[PDB]
Amino acid sequence: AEAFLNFTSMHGVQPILKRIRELSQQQLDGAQVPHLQWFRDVAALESPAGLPLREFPFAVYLITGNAGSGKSTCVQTINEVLDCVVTGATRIAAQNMYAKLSGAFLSRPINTIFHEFGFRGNHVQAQLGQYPYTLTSNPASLEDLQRRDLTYYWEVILDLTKRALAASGGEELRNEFRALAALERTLGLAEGALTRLAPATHGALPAFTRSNVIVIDEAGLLGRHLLTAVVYCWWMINALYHTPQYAARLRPVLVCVGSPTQTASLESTFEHQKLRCSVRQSENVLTYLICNRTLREYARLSYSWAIFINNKRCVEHEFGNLMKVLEYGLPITEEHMQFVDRFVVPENYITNPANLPGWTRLFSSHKEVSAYMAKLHAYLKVTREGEFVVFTLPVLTFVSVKEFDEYRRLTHQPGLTIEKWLTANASRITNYSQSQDQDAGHMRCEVHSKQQLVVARNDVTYVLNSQIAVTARLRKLVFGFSGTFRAFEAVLRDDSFVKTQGETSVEFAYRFLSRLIFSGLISFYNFLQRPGLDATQRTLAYARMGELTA
Amino acid sequence: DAYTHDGRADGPTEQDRFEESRALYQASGGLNGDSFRVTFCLLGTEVGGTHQARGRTRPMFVCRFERADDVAALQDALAHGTPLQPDHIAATLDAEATFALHANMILALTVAINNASPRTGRDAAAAQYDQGASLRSLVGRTSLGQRGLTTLYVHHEVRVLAAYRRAYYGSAQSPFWFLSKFGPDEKSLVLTTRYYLLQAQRLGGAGATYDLQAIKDICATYAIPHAPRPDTVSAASLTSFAAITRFCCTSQYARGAAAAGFPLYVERRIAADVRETSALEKFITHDRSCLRVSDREFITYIYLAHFECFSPPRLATH
Amino acid sequence: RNALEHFGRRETLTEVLGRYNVQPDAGGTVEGFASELLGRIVACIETHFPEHAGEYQAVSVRRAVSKDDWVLLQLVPVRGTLQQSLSCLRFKHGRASRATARTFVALSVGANNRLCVSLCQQCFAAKCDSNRLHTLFTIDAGTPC
Amino acid sequence: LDEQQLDVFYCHYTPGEPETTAAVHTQFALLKRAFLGRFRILQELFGEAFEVAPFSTYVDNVIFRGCEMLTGSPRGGLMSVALQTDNYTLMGYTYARVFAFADELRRRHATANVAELLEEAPLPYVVLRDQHGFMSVVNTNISEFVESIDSTELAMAINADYGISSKLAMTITRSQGLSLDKVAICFTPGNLRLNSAYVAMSRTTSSEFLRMNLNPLRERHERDDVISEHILSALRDPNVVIVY
DNA sequence: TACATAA
Ligand SMILES: [Zn+2]
């Protein structure tokens, strides 16, 4: 049924709600709230060596558990009961969380945390970590860890502070909240009766000025230095505008949801003098909180931890036991080794596209994926089962000669072949990591003059009638077709299609379905021209249609 | 929902509130009484307050029905489902009660209008008004009632609409959304809607901190048998609210003892579940505390105990 | 007890083997069953490892490990295939460091009352490990029920 | 054929241009009512044969020549944003020029050289069909690459692709944020870790559709139990909430 | 070996 599947997951979340409510209402002292002078002094620096030892207060709540174990219901209840800001580490996670929340009761659009604290396009290509930092105090204090995390993230943090303090129009302090407070003081009204209406009147205010409870889903896919930056950004965003929560001395509460075991983060670096990319493993936020002694004592993680056990997906006994053994690091016996022997299959069996049709193959490298995709495309071309025809499309990159000249002047490198540089930097020009798994042909280079550009053209091979995913925004336009009459009537009866679009396109969307309905006629006789249907029934249909038209 | 103001300080028993509330919804759909004070309300969260759970509904205006014609129209609207014409609401509108709500918002909108730049330093010969005198005069010259609101609507309709559509977030929803969220059954569509949207915050019991799905699951076991209505609603009619309003207002679950005893059962069921859950959790935690046993056997114990306490057969029996 | 009452009883290796008229004890029955099953093993190794073809032309089966749920037999090449030690089927090792890989057939229950036969190898090379047993592939054998 | 061979309702009905929201709603409602009535009549007439018959309605004249889609002008159709969580089916490529996409590419990018170099030799747009069955042209994936060296930022490269990925083969690390149905893992001996194996075999809800080239438990693997110990020690803490 | 953020 559906009633007993939520019994244990609806009476066990109330303590979580009570603890988050108690955490989110604690008031600091007047001497611990970061002042605007802190960020003004930070923005007036050149190297992260003049950073003083200051602490940014915060609190955390951990909600950890395996994938599919039911933390989404906890987040749903938190959103429905509390006044929180729900975010996501990636766009896929944000979209999934928005789908769940909007399917439960109601939700605002959900954005990533990077968009929440102001991560712009340029900050993507910053050199994360160049100034050495050595811990001084043993054991380390909170201020030392915060300073280390700020030094690691120096470029992005400095750019964020500079942009935030420069977008204020000079020395003129932002008047989104100050005018309302002044009117409150003059008119003799209750505190917060007028300032809290500022988000209603102004629609450009950031979400960090609206609530102090920030829910981060899939917190394991994040660097540990993002545990401080967020908090830092929060204080900055609440120091500029003099938000009512800042005047009430409230601290940010970060509710992290994710699985610490089957999820990790990576750090990449580029050596220009060698044209090399090196990727290593680092600590995520969950491991940073769970393992570090200082953060464990500061955040009181014993009283702020909720572990979700039991899996709604696993339905096998031996597989479940093996999964439990793997997750908790239990000793591996010989019975497990004998059990896993069922799935062993020769490598040539897997790599051959003929065997196991329609299965997803996981490799440990991009070259293997590319080779398998090329083999699959070649096999589909010759041994065609039909309904899928393999075609190719052009793709191209433009390089500016002046920028390359500046780059070579800065980075020595007396000679630099276009092909060699593009091959070495093939993992950074693109905006998605699946570009290295695409079947590509011979790479061609040419020099286009009067534009002072270099064009690198290639071909990418695709399979017709295949299920694929779009890994970008990629605004699209719909222009008709519905497959079958049943689907057309299903989409006509339901108005959810209009609601899926934004609340600005309804009128001409309705216009578009109206013209689709108009153009959907004719060719009904072709259906009536199906082989051997009837003779008199056609005349009966004629009469019925004429009567309906009349 | 209908309620009467309480003057008796002694806490009524469960059997007293049920009889008091059942006497309101008589067996005609229309509430008893000679005068009514109705608060017309919309979806949206209230700001500036602090409660256990954030508000789900925000009042929009207030009307008073005391005359015979107005009372008859209100009873017809509440019983059968005939919509209220704007003439009746305009005539019965309670001006100061509704415009005490739209007093801070008008001030905020006026401040946002005039926030271009407060130079107030023109000097000249007679235009040397003080740095704070211009703002004081402008604030004091704004009527925080009907005149200010209508002037703002006439001059700045687009921005006023955009601002009012943000404080009342979610107030514009289609009937299909209401049918899909709070539905699909008639009993759910009536009782769950009325409790979750209106009575949960007002009563403020132990059920004020439960989500929509939990309230629906609780209502699932509220098994008042039936009374088969002649006809039901169908598709292609959810374009307008008239069909769903007529369906809900003439329902068996919107009046009588069926609607007079749902919050009491919600509290009873919540308490009954918590009584067992807390004890079982305490047992499991105490056995967890010491348990000087190896890791593999500890995991075995944890999963075995959690399965034995809340196995699906035991949940079904409970 | 909960697992038995929830997921059902699982057959032991003895009953499944007896379903093929083969007893784990007495030695000879297991070796005869392996002799019958060898055809599928050589067919699979020919299909997927074509370079190692003549090594398995004439092989003999000898019991190595007998247990309640797992039976391991050794595949000796009837002492008449010139190459005394079979080569490793995973990697190409050095010329001097001959891959003296011993090959085994492992019988277990596995799936729902079916039978699982697997090929295993022990290679004393420095690249693989030695002392360690590597499973190469597993083929279903349950058909003559 | 008979005299009424072309659904003479066309000659008797003129769908004039719409008007304000109320008029749009009325015209849409009447057209929908007529279409629903015709659908009901022809469904009652035939049944399942009519229900599963192929249906194809397009705003303009659309021709499918092999793998290419040919249309005169892509005028008419709502704009939307393609979601990475939605499932699309590849249908082909078209060379039809969309004014909105070109204008957006001009506006968003300050580099006009890329803009008119793409204008002179335009890439084909990709047509995809959603789960419901709505054909849509998707804009090309255009990416900027600005390199930051020391304290110097240079807008160096501009890439132009289609930004579509096939769910047939992927890396193990990429699969840690996905859920799959049938999985055939291909480990590499020498650098095998138990965490990678756990992530790989954790992607399938059942073991009936799992395959691998080697036994990850019988080989040499790297074990780093620093988090599992902390989690197990947390399960013995009376202050830690546990939800079943 | 190896992924995300930008919009
Ligand atoms: Zn070997």
mmCIF file of C-alpha atoms in Angstrom, chain A residues 18-122:
data_model
loop_
_atom_site.group_PDB
_atom_site.id
_atom_site.type_symbol
_atom_site.label_atom_id
_atom_site.label_comp_id
_atom_site.label_asym_id
_atom_site.label_seq_id
_atom_site.Cartn_x
_atom_site.Cartn_y
_atom_site.Cartn_z
ATOM 1 C CA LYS A 18 12.655 20.835 16.796
ATOM 2 C CA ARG A 19 16.461 20.832 16.808
ATOM 3 C CA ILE A 20 16.673 22.955 13.653
ATOM 4 C CA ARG A 21 14.127 25.406 15.085
ATOM 5 C CA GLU A 22 16.142 25.703 18.297
ATOM 6 C CA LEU A 23 19.408 26.120 16.366
ATOM 7 C CA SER A 24 18.013 28.748 13.983
ATOM 8 C CA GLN A 25 16.763 31.110 16.724
ATOM 9 C CA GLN A 26 19.867 31.429 18.917
ATOM 10 C CA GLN A 27 21.139 34.998 19.256
ATOM 11 C CA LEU A 28 24.808 35.975 19.306
ATOM 12 C CA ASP A 29 26.477 38.646 21.418
ATOM 13 C CA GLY A 30 27.080 42.156 20.136
ATOM 14 C CA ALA A 31 30.847 41.625 19.853
ATOM 15 C CA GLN A 32 30.807 38.507 17.636
ATOM 16 C CA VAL A 33 28.737 39.769 14.684
ATOM 17 C CA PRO A 34 31.028 40.492 11.701
ATOM 18 C CA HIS A 35 31.063 44.193 10.878
ATOM 19 C CA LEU A 36 31.215 45.740 7.407
ATOM 20 C CA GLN A 37 34.735 46.972 8.207
ATOM 21 C CA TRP A 38 35.954 43.360 8.072
ATOM 22 C CA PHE A 39 34.927 42.987 4.427
ATOM 23 C CA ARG A 40 36.033 46.537 3.598
ATOM 24 C CA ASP A 41 39.517 45.717 4.914
ATOM 25 C CA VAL A 42 39.482 42.393 3.051
ATOM 26 C CA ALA A 43 38.584 44.076 -0.247
ATOM 27 C CA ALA A 44 41.480 46.534 0.204
ATOM 28 C CA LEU A 45 44.155 43.803 0.152
ATOM 29 C CA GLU A 46 46.506 42.387 -2.475
ATOM 30 C CA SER A 47 47.766 39.094 -1.000
ATOM 31 C CA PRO A 48 46.114 36.803 1.568
ATOM 32 C CA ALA A 49 48.895 37.500 4.074
ATOM 33 C CA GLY A 50 47.327 40.499 5.828
ATOM 34 C CA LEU A 51 44.189 38.550 6.712
ATOM 35 C CA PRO A 52 43.711 38.767 10.503
ATOM 36 C CA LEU A 53 42.435 36.041 12.815
ATOM 37 C CA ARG A 54 38.667 36.578 12.878
ATOM 38 C CA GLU A 55 35.846 34.070 13.290
ATOM 39 C CA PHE A 56 32.588 33.930 11.334
ATOM 40 C CA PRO A 57 29.929 32.242 13.511
ATOM 41 C CA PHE A 58 27.805 29.480 12.010
ATOM 42 C CA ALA A 59 25.963 26.278 12.876
ATOM 43 C CA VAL A 60 25.399 23.028 10.987
ATOM 44 C CA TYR A 61 22.971 20.115 10.997
ATOM 45 C CA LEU A 62 23.978 16.825 9.373
ATOM 46 C CA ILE A 63 21.435 14.626 7.558
ATOM 47 C CA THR A 64 23.389 11.678 6.110
ATOM 48 C CA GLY A 65 22.198 8.387 4.691
ATOM 49 C CA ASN A 66 22.374 6.101 1.742
ATOM 50 C CA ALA A 67 20.933 6.936 -1.658
ATOM 51 C CA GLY A 68 17.177 6.333 -1.806
ATOM 52 C CA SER A 69 16.769 5.914 1.970
ATOM 53 C CA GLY A 70 14.348 8.827 2.352
ATOM 54 C CA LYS A 71 16.196 12.069 3.114
ATOM 55 C CA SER A 72 14.123 13.790 0.414
ATOM 56 C CA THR A 73 11.048 13.415 2.634
ATOM 57 C CA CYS A 74 12.965 15.110 5.458
ATOM 58 C CA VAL A 75 13.857 17.983 3.129
ATOM 59 C CA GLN A 76 10.208 18.173 2.017
ATOM 60 C CA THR A 77 9.029 18.459 5.622
ATOM 61 C CA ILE A 78 11.706 21.064 6.389
ATOM 62 C CA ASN A 79 10.608 23.133 3.387
ATOM 63 C CA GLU A 80 6.921 22.825 4.293
ATOM 64 C CA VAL A 81 7.375 23.662 8.001
ATOM 65 C CA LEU A 82 10.423 25.928 8.269
ATOM 66 C CA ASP A 83 11.446 29.015 6.276
ATOM 67 C CA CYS A 84 14.595 27.754 4.556
ATOM 68 C CA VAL A 85 16.550 28.242 1.333
ATOM 69 C CA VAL A 86 16.903 24.974 -0.588
ATOM 70 C CA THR A 87 19.942 24.729 -2.861
ATOM 71 C CA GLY A 88 21.965 22.094 -4.702
ATOM 72 C CA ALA A 89 25.557 21.227 -5.473
ATOM 73 C CA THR A 90 24.782 20.637 -9.174
ATOM 74 C CA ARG A 91 22.001 21.562 -11.585
ATOM 75 C CA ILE A 92 20.754 17.965 -11.812
ATOM 76 C CA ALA A 93 20.377 17.753 -8.029
ATOM 77 C CA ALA A 94 18.690 21.164 -7.928
ATOM 78 C CA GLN A 95 16.218 20.140 -10.638
ATOM 79 C CA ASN A 96 15.471 16.840 -8.875
ATOM 80 C CA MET A 97 14.851 18.634 -5.580
ATOM 81 C CA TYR A 98 12.635 21.209 -7.295
ATOM 82 C CA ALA A 99 10.641 18.426 -8.949
ATOM 83 C CA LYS A 100 10.123 16.683 -5.604
ATOM 84 C CA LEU A 101 9.175 19.872 -3.743
ATOM 85 C CA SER A 102 6.819 21.152 -6.454
ATOM 86 C CA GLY A 103 5.222 17.712 -6.634
ATOM 87 C CA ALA A 104 4.660 17.609 -2.881
ATOM 88 C CA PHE A 105 2.980 20.945 -2.137
ATOM 89 C CA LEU A 106 4.631 24.043 -3.614
ATOM 90 C CA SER A 107 8.101 25.452 -4.204
ATOM 91 C CA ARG A 108 10.011 28.401 -5.595
ATOM 92 C CA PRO A 109 12.562 27.790 -8.368
ATOM 93 C CA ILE A 110 15.655 26.069 -6.977
ATOM 94 C CA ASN A 111 19.150 27.244 -7.914
ATOM 95 C CA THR A 112 22.629 25.955 -7.173
ATOM 96 C CA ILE A 113 24.577 27.236 -4.176
ATOM 97 C CA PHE A 114 27.187 28.776 -6.496
ATOM 98 C CA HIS A 115 24.504 30.966 -8.057
ATOM 99 C CA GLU A 116 23.249 31.683 -4.530
ATOM 100 C CA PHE A 117 26.492 33.189 -3.211
ATOM 101 C CA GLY A 118 27.360 34.906 -6.493
ATOM 102 C CA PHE A 119 29.636 32.578 -8.488
ATOM 103 C CA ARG A 120 30.043 34.182 -11.923
ATOM 104 C CA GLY A 121 31.380 32.873 -15.227
ATOM 105 C CA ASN A 122 34.992 34.036 -14.950
#
